[PDB]
C-alpha cells in the first residue's frame, strides 16, 4: 500500500462502480456484463474493509445498493452567462438588425443561420471530457442541476470522443435545446393518459417535464433529444468560427442539426428565412424561427453582448400562426 494509491484506487473504482448502478438502475442500459459488476463491488467492498474510513454513507457499496440518485434542482452557476437572443418578428427588423451589424463590422461578418428548436435550454459541462454538470438556464447566471436528467438522454454522451484534428478541450461548455419530437410526444402522451396521467399540451411542455423529474429514472424512458448550438466557456479550444466549432463538436460526439447554413449576407439570409417559412412544417421536431449569428468569433466579441442579450446573433420568429 501507499495511504495516496489507496486513495486513488477507491475513488477510481468507486467512481466506476457508481456509473454502473447508474446505468443498471437509473437507465436500464448496462455496458458491462451482468457478471464483471460483480467482481468490482466486490473489490471495493473489499477494499472498504482494509480501510475502514473510507466507507461512508455517501459511498457506492454502503448506502446505495439500487439508490442515491435524485435530483433536486439546486442552484448551480454557469461558467459563462448564459444570455438569451433578441428576437426580430419583421423583414425590417431584420435589416435593422443586419445594418447596425454592417455599421461596426463591415462585409467581414457571415451569417450562421439555423433553425430554432422550440424546447427546453440545456448547458452542460464538460471537465478532461467528461460530463460533469448539466443545467437548466435559470436567470442566465445560475440554473437548476438537472445532471442525472441529461445524462439519460440518448444524444448526451458522457464522455468525449478523442478526434484528429479536434482535440478533447479541458472545459466545454456547450449549449442546446432539448425537445420531442412530434410522434414521440404523442406516443407519450398517450402511455401517461393510459396510466390516469394528464397529459401535456404541447411538445415544449413535455420535454421541459420530462427533463425535470425529482427521480431520473422517469427521464430515462421518455425519447428525449438534445441539438447542441452554441458554446459558453472553453479551454483548450479556440475556434475561429461558429461553423467550425461544430465540426469538432461532431468529431467529439456531440449532437448537432444538419440544418445549418453559412450566408454571406442579409440577402442570403433572408432566402433562408423564407425557405424554411415554407418548409419547417417538414422537420420532425418544433421549429419556430431561425436564429441568425455572426460566424466569425472574433467579431462577435468585438460586438459584445448587452445585459440581456448578445449583439451579434438575434432570431427571427415566424408568426405563431
Ligand atoms: C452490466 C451491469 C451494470 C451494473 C449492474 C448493477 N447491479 C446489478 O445488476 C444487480 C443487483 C442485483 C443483482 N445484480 C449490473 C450489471
Redesign the pocket.
Known sequence: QTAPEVLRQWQALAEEVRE??F???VRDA?????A???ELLRRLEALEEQHPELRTPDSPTQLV?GAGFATDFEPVDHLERMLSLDNAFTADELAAWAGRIHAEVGDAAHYLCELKIDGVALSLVYREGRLTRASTRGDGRTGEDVTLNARTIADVPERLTPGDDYPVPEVLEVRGEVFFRLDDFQALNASLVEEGKAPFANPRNSAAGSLRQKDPAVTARRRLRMICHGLGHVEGFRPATLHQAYLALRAWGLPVSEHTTLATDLAGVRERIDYWGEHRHEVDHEIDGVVVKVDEVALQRRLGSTSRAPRWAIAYKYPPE
Open positions: 454502473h448502478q446505468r443498471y438502475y448496462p455496458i458491462i456484463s451482468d464483471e459488476f460483480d445498493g
